[PDB]
Amino acid sequence: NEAGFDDDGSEFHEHIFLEKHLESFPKQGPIRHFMELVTCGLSKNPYLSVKQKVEHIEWFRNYFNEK
Amino acid sequence: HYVDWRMWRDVKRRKMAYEYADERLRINSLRKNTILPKILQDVADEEIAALPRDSCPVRIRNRCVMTSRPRGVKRRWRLSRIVFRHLADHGQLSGIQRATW
Amino acid sequence: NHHTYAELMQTLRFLGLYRDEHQDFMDEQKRLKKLRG
Amino acid sequence: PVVTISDEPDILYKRLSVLVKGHDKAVLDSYEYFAVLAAKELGISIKVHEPPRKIERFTLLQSVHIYKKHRVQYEMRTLYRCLELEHLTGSTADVYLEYIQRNLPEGVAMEVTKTQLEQLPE
Amino acid sequence: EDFIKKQIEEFNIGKRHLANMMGEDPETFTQEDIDRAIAYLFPSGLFEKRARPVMKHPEQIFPRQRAIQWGEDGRPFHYLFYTGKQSYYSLMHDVYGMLLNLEKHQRWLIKEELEEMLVEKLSDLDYMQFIRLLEKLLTSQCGAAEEEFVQRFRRSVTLESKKQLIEPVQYDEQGMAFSKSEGKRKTAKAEAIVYKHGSGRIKVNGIDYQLYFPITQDREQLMFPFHFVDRLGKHDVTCTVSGGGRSAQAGAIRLAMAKALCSFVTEDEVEWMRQAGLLTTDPRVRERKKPGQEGARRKFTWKK
Amino acid sequence: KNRAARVRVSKGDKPVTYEEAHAPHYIAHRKGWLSLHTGNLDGEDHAAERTVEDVFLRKFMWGTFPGCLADQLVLKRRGNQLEICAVVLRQLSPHKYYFLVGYSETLLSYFYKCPVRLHLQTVPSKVVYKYL
Amino acid sequence: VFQDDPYLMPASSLESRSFLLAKKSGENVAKFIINSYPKYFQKDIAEPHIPCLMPEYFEPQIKDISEAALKERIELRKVKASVDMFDQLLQAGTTVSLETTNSLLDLLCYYGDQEPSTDYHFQQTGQSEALEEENDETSRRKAGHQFGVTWRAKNNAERIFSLMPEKNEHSYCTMIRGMVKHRAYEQALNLYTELLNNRLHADVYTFNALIEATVCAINEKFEEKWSKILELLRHMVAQKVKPNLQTFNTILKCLRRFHVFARSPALQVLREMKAIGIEPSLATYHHIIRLFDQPGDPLKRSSFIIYDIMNELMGKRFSPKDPDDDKFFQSAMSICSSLRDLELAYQVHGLLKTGDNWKFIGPDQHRNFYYSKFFDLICLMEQIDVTLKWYEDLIPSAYFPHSQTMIHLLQALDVANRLEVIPKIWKDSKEYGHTFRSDLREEILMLMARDKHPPELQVAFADCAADIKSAYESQPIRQTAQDWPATSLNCIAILFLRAGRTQEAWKMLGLFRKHNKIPRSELLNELMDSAKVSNSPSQAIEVVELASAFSLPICEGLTQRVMSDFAINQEQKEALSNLTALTS
Amino acid sequence: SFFTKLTADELWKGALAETGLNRGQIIGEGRYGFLWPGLNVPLVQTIAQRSKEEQEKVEADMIQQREEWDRKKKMKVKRERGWSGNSWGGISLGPPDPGPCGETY
Amino acid sequence: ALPPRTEKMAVDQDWPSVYPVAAPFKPSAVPLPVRMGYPVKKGVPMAKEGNLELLKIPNFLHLTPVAIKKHCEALKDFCTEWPAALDSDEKCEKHFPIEIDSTDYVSSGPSVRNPRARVVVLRVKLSSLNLDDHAKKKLIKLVGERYCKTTDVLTIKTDRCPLRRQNYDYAVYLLTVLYHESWNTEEWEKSK
RNA sequence: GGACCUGGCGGUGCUUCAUAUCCCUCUAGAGGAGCCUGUUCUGUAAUCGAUAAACCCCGAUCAACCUCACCACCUCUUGCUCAGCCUAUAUACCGCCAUCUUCAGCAAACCCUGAUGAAGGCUACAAAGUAAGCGCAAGUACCCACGUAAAGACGUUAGGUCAAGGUGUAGCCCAUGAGGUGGCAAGAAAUGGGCUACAUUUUCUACCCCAGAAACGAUAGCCCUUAUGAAAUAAGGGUCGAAGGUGGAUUUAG
Ligand SMILES: C[NH+](C)c1cc(NC(=O)CNC(C)(C)C)c(O)c2c1C[C@H]1C[C@H]3[C@H]([NH+](C)C)C(O)=C(C(N)=O)C(=O)[C@@]3(O)C(O)=C1C2=O
Ligand SMILES: [Mg+2]
Ligand SMILES: [Mg+2]
Ligand SMILES: [Mg+2]
Ligand SMILES: [Mg+2]
Ligand SMILES: [Mg+2]
Ligand SMILES: [Mg+2]
Ligand SMILES: [Mg+2]
């Protein structure tokens, strides 16, 4: 049921452990709490991969820097 | 070459909602998280209220896949009542019998 | 999408590889309707 | 008959259980006799089981405009038959699976296979 | 007919091919061999057994075509031809003649079976007259030729027996004798194990009957078979029970208990308690709601 | 009265086959199913597009095999081999038959992206089960 | 490949070929309409992705004048478009790189300044099956000329070669190969001399092309061309390029063109192959087989090397290397048919059954020739039980037999005196479509009415002959309006009388009178016997009148027999006397 | 839509309303007229598309055949008059039907 | 038409050679006058040569016992045998402790994408892990919602990552880090 | 006008029956109160279809926008479409049903009777009827052969739907077609069907039937919070403590 579909050799840490793309702010902040929430959500996504996970993360980074 | 203008309007809804799904997802998460300040949510309220009123999944009507009929559709084949009756009565649909229990 | 479907059947019929009686009906009926109307 | 015994020890499948779902008990038990005889001449251990059938019943109107009091009711018979394999090899497993999925029946067949590879902890 | 002949030849070659086809190159391939073979090769799955595949000989497949009743001169063969019911009227004449010369000297067939034997369509009153004439032949004291005539016309009865199936006594556990029976009533199942002695002790689902059955009606339901058979404080039952409600469970326990006390009681008494109505499953189960109704048989409002 | 798939008795002169003759309440008691695909059981996802491709296939084969299909096809579906098994008549020439078989073979393999196989079966005349 | 319906069966090899070409026609039907309309099919549903189910785009998507567009239309095989925009690059002044100028001249040399043919080439094998026994030399002269592109002077390839600045080995090799392919042999040799002057290296393909060009040159002796081939291989060794199987197979094809004088050179070539260590292929053996087999050779030691070849070649499994392995099997059992050797035919068939040599059989025409001559040999010198076993094993599973094969079946069955098998093979021939074969009809009828038979064989022959006559009647209005043969009519009549269908014999004697064909004396005597059985003086007088009208010299004996054997009235006596007076 | 197209017999039933015409077509004719080697012309093996003047000449032949077949629908049949036109009293039915007992009138 | 191979065909003929593949009915190829259908009142079941019901039957005319015998004469090459791991469940548990659920769901159509088919779940025995005392106390206190009492089976679920092999990786990673955090003594264990 | 034939009718006769229908009977309701939801009427700039049995929680297994075909305003012309139209006709239709049907008849092809009229065809101790085919029946599904399902032909009511879709006829194409934005679904009243009650076999609590206590009733109104949604209908809590005293004629269901 998984013929092809390598997902560039993601291998289980890029999908759920998003510290390396989290790029820690002051972790006591509500922004960092939102990052924890969205990180847990993107970890629990099985339908999305690491590339769209990190473009979601970067979209939030861009919007938060805009504000 | 669609069944009717209502079906074509619905497929416009589907295609461009599927395009404009991600931004709405980010900003309605920004609605219903209770961490951010209220005005910092109000600017987000402005952005979704400006996001067009054809991509929100509130206009998506599951019509019949062969012939446009809003009410009376079985989801498992996207078929209307009498079209599903027609096909599963002529017998081109596997496993559907007449329920006699 | 219905466009690939309907326009492919359209192209195949006017290539002559497809014969659909509904379009035959509309052709004959519109021929008579332009004859008299 | 290319073989190519390559490098690494067996994946050690215990209980590869095949749930065969069908609309048709005749297809299910003919396939049962097929799989049982194939497993018997293979030498692997086969056991039979019959999970109970599920009937998906639902109701539609009969006329197009009025007359709700006269409805039609349609049903689906989803019968399940279980062929559990215990004590079969990984190579025997995927060759037996390959054979039975070549000769899997049509739309009246699904082959839900449950594989328990054992391994060592780490 | 040549159609029948070439069909018979085709069936012979086909059954030879069928046995060689499956595994059975030896010449003896029986009809039930043929049926199981075609059942495996073509998965039937149609609710009508006549809509299933069939591989029989053309005698059974094709109906009985009556032979030509006249040769190439006109002149039909049987002398009672122009009646149009030649076999039936010949049978009347023959039975009448045996009655006549018997008087000078001194279950039953169904209409469908008689029509099959005569290969002629018959009327109901015609069949009644035939049965009446054969009754007259039996009532008159007749000889052995007439007896074998009547016995060729008469068929079997296939009587059943209503003696209740006695379960074997299982001398097991440590040294005790028990019987393990089953009961079902209204989606409830009860497997009961009664030991012959024990002075009366009930173990429904690990607890006693005063705990699992706080209702005196349920206690009377468990009472009922002991009190009919006058063996009240003599036995002990342990029950496992699944599903249903309080009275369905009580009735299922009563049924399984009675169907093991059958093994623990004499044959005259078990016939008597079947007559009392303790060994028969109650088929009264819930019906189905219907589309356009308000229940199983209850309908909606104003209809007339 | 019920007339879902019941052909009505005209005068006793109407050729009809088993499938058109039998009523929809004999759909699994006497008839069977004309398309065998796995979408309609307990656990499956894509049955809707299975059905839409089924009706596409029926109308397409009828439009491209004009006036030679005796009764309706058998649309079997196993793995990724589609089977269109046909009861086609013996009127048009076998060169035309093979031409349309290859044409349909290739286009349907190409439109549904799998192995698609058409298996013809030639019949002299449209078969009559009973005269109604 | 064919279907399983009895109406859709091919009956003959021509019908099978027509069915197959119609199927390939429909295949490229869908290919054409699909590549014309790729938009309707861009939606992929299968996973994983199938690029050979994805559309092939034949239009150039790159429109600006660029080297990427040059590589694009070179890959798309658009010769005129590539030439025109290479010109456009030249007037634009963009320096076009060496590799893509090479690729452009590669396309030009491969296609001869023309587009690729829109039809996938399956033609030029449409010879009729009624001329397979005469004039193979003129057949060679009118069938060895494929209408390819002759190398025209001042073409686009030569223009690009003159225009491009820095000539190299790849371009020189390409244009020598292209000149050889388009029959500019002398120009290719001159360009090779220019290569040697310019100090470049020519590769294996170019050297094989040069060998072919030297051989295809006109007005030179085989000795001179052999010395030239030796000089070219010495140049190969001096340029340190290693020759191979295709090189020596081109050499073997050339000496096959060079006939009787090149047999010992062919042996030297194969010995040098085994000395160097490159495995000779089936097509190597094909070239030496067809060299040593020539009509008019009275020695056949050139046919004993075939036993040498198989003595090398038993028990081996092969892989595809060289296109003439199907021709190897066809030619080697062409030797078998020429030599009439059952043991070698069986040994080649065993080599065939070893492994994928059944794949090495090749095309349908070669397969039909293969099994046709094999079964001709089987019927010629095998015993009848194993000929019938090979008949049921090969026909029609392997091939569709021919009418010459049919008459050879009849000859074999007549030699074996197993005339009870004639109706079965007759029904098989009518099944395969030999109904309108008059030679087959004449052969079956003469072998069929030659002798007196047991009555069940007689009535089976009566049914077969009645159906033959039904076909003869049911051939209406064709340009080959074959008149009723006298021998066929006489044999049909004799069979009808022997089976006892006298009335149909009489009405086809009416057909004798209708078609003005002279009847046979044995037939007239059998008619005398049938008239004796039926006691019919009128029928006897009718057939005696037929004999008198055809003026046969047995009519006096027929009249004397009728007088001796029938009680005849005076007016019939007078009529018979008048007929005898007219014949006298 | 192609999906909501229907069948010839059903459309004739719906149009005629009797319960209360494609025979003049070859298998491969289209308005583009890309004549195949399997369809129309027999099986040289060369795919081609015929020219314009051939397209309109072929369809003009088809439409004059249409008009001729409309005419062969619309002849007038000649019925002999029995005692008057539109009557039945002198109309000659044919010979009596041949008897199944080897009898003919 | 032609007289068919049904009556051209004679006894002792190889049937794996006749029908290699799963194919629809083809009555001319079938040497059997098989009759379908509910018969008419004064008639017989409908004949063989044209039955769409014969066609619609899933047609297990490509598989008989002697064919499957010969098929697995060919297919007998593709197998090893087992060691003496024994039929004893406790013996095979001792030899190989952990147990893992990793499945496939075979559909039939254009695509083989059943996402739920990546479900993976690991069951391991503490009595086979053999190295847990206050570590097993800490273990249970970590995984409260699993570890039913009546059998010593630990069942950890993964359906969070799209691929089956990295689901297996999540199972083994969770096992080893739950083990390591159980053996990591924390400073607030005593104030329980 | 006279005499008939066939059918329908009869507050038409005799006889035998109906059994949840015909009555006497048996149980539980409606009709009386509140609420929900359709319909009529009124209203609005604001769809349409059903309308005794066989309409009235009906198309809808379902309208905040969407749905939507309604209205208001403003825009589009080869308009997603070799356009389209939810424009008119269910009295042109196919398609999909209701009703008799909680029936058993409809009948090709013949033969006979009636001076060869419409028409009719019955007597088993038998006087002209024989009958292919549909239907009942039979065979299937569910737990049995019981029961419930399914099934019930020809025809009836021009019975329902051009609005599920297709479609003939007539019409439009500056329109009656297409798109965008915003509103339409309120009761001086009435009526159909449901839900909850008017409590003592009741109410609250634990238990899920061996107690303690009382000695009533909105799923309505208002407020708060939550769910889902761009934008509240639904859910919970708070608040409140209606009318209501087991309902006549008539009627429903078993
Ligand atoms: C006026 N009448 C003579 C009539 C006429 C037509 N149609 C036409 O004549 C129109 N014809 C044109 C369009 C001009 C070509 C009609 O179409 C109708 C009717 C009658 C109705 C009566 C309907 C009524 N319903 C609404 C309750 C009724 O009492 C019944 C019934 N059985 O209950 C009906 O029969 C009725 O529904 C009905 O069918 C009518 C018409 O169809
Ligand atoms: Mg009904
Ligand atoms: Mg007139
Ligand atoms: Mg409008
Ligand atoms: Mg009406
Ligand atoms: Mg109306
Ligand atoms: Mg019903
Ligand atoms: Mg019935």
Attribute tags:
part of a larger assembly; 9 chains; B: 101 residues; mainly alpha; 48% helix; 7% strand; I: 192 residues; three-stranded antiparallel β-sheet; 8 helices; elongated; binds tigecycline; binds magnesium ion; RNA-binding; Small ribosomal subunit protein uS10m (chain D); ribosomal protein (chain D); mitochondrion (chain D); ribonucleoprotein (chain D); Small ribosomal subunit protein mS33 (chain C)
Can you walk through the features of this model?
The structure is cut from a larger assembly and holds 9 protein chains of 9 kinds. Chain A is mostly helical and 67 residues long. Chain A has helices at residues 30-44, 50-66. Chain A is elongated and about 45 Å long. Chain A starts with 29 loop residues before the first helix and ends with a helix. Chain C is 78% helix and 0% strand. Chain C has 2 helices and no strands. The longest helix of chain C is centred in the last third of the chain and has 16 residues, at 21-36. Chain C is elongated. Chain G is elongated, with a radius of gyration of 34 Å. Classes of the chains: A mainly alpha (67), B mainly alpha (101), C mainly alpha (37), D alpha+beta (122), E alpha+beta (304), F alpha/beta (132), G mainly alpha (584), H mainly alpha (105), I alpha+beta (192). The D-I interface holds D 1, 3, 10, 12, 14, 24, 27, 30-31, 34, 37-38, 41-42, 87, 89, 91-92, 95, 99, 101, 103-122 and I 22, 58, 60, 62-63, 65, 68-69, 71-72, 75-82, 87, 92, 96-108, 124, 129, 172, 175-176. Bound molecules: tigecycline and magnesium ion (MG) (7 copies). One magnesium ion binds at residues 85-86 of chain H. Chain B binds one RNA strand of 254 nucleotides through residues 1-6, 8-13, 24, 28, 31, 45, 48-51, 53-54, 56-61, 63-64, 66-74, 80-83, 85-86, 97-101.
Summarize the structure.
This is part of a larger assembly, with nine protein chains of nine kinds. Chain A has about 70 residues and is mostly helical.
